[PDB]
Amino acid sequence: KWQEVDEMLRAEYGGSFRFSSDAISTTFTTNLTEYSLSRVDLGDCIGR
Amino acid sequence: VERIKTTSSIEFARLQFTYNHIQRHVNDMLGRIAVAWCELQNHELTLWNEARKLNPNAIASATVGRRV
Amino acid sequence: NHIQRHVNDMLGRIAVAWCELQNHELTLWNEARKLNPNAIASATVGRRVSARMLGDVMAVSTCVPVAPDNVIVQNSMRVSSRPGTCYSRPLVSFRYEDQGPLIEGQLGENNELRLTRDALEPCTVGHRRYFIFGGGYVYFEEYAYSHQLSRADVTTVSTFIDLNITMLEDHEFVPLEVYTRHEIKDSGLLDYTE
Amino acid sequence: DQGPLIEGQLGENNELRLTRDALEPCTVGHRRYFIFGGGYVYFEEYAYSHQLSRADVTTVSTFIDLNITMLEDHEFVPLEVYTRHEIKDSGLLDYTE
Amino acid sequence: DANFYVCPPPTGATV
User: Where, if anywhere, are coiled coils annotated (chain B)?
Assistant: First the structure.
């Protein structure tokens, strides 16, 4: 775990999600489809 | 099943945030200016009609671009 | 901070200039309002409204719409009852709506239907006149009908000042490193752990 | 306050003129508002009817609206994916230690 | 302006 963002704004545009955080001044870009956690090897910390 | 690899540099996303913020503000303000400009020209057409009645020579010389 | 200060100061100057220009053109609006209360009234209230000047204010009464298909324009502005006198604008007969009396009248500016036929001027040789008729103009010579013509048949000059503002486009910033941390690790000649 | 009270004719935009010469033929249905001080004065049939405030007259605007807002301040906090401590700690054995 | 208008002379009902 790296960052906890209490205000993350998600916007849909051009087939992409943009997750913006004013607190840390950061915009992440993801695809629309979710990432299944089963693809992570030994990633049991993520959910909890 | 695989491991996600992470870049050491977050500054690309911070540049993205700053650019998006500035770009949205500037685009919104300049679109507002564009709308106001178009409305003002459409609004001033009335004054131009009346001045056209008052003095056809000057109005035509100014609108045409050549003195007539 | 640099960009924000510059943009804020420029746009504040633009805001001040805009407010002053509106306040400054109020004078021109007052004088035009005296010149032709109907047109300025329609522009300022957002709807076609007849207007007149009562002292230093405007009396406004809503105009009633009439479909274009119920208007017929006559041929000659020459009023036969007044030889040596002519109608300054073409005569029309219009019916407010089907199943109505065909009310006689005169074409007034911006497709107005004026009940009063009082606009009379001395006739003059060389008469050549265009008048707003529906979506186009109508054209007369020698106080006699010639033809209706489309709006596109007349040369268009612009009183508008052009301003071409385009939006800043979207831009994507990809991750970019001169050396990855793995390159930094592999920069060492001997790795103690290995 | 102590001078001779001069009779004249009201002008436009609270002007006070010296000569009473703006004479028009009388007409029926006379109803007129005039700029009087900070408000209007209303006359009906060439007789003083009453004053009224400007707020009593509906207002139409000749101004074009334009709403410019400032770009607000923004604070950028320090932000690293990994600190130097994390980079140094990612080694399995530290030769010095 | 495709639609004509009939504009009765205004009265001071609305100012």
Answer: none
Q: Which residues contact C85 (CB under 8 A, 6 or more apart)?
A: C79, C120, C121, C122, C123
Sign of CA dihedral D50, D54, D59, D63: positive
| Residues of chain B positioned with their CB less than 8 A from the CB of C177 | 7-9
CA distance C88 to C118: 9
State the structure-solving technique.
cryo-EM
Output the CA–CA distances (angstroms, integers) from residue D67 to A20, A41, B20, B44, D63, in the order listed.
Answer: 26, 53, 21, 20, 12
Resolution (A): 2.2
Q: What single letter denotes the amino acid at residue C37? A: P
Helix pair B11-54, C37-45: axis angle to 10 deg:
160
Instruction: Tell me the C-alpha distance between B11 and B23, whole Å.
Output: 18
Q: Measured between CB atoms, does D60 come within 8 Å of chain A? A: no
- Residues of chain A contacting D, Cβ within 8 Å: 2, 22-26
The residue in chain D having the minimum alpha-carbon distance to the alpha carbon of residue A2 is: D81
- Nearest C-alpha in D relative to C32: D62
- Which tokens belong to E7? 């504009």
Please state, in angstroms and as integers, the Cα–Cα distance from residue C106 to each residue in C67, C103, C185, E9, following that order: 16, 10, 93, 15
Is A47 within 8 Å of B8 (Cβ atoms)? no
Q: What is the 3-state secondary structure (H, E, C) of D35-77?
A: EECCEEEEEECCCEEEEECHHHCCCCCCCCCCCCCCCCCCCCC
Pairwise CA distance, residues D37 & D35, whole Å: 6
What the block records as the tokens of D27 is: 């007409």
Do E and B make contact, counting contact as 3+ CB pairs within 8 angstroms?
no
Q: Are strands D39-44 and D48-52 parallel, antiparallel or unpaired?
A: antiparallel
D35 within 8 A of D12, measured Cβ to Cβ? yes
Asked if C101 and C94 count as a contact pair (C-beta separation under 8 A), the reply is: no
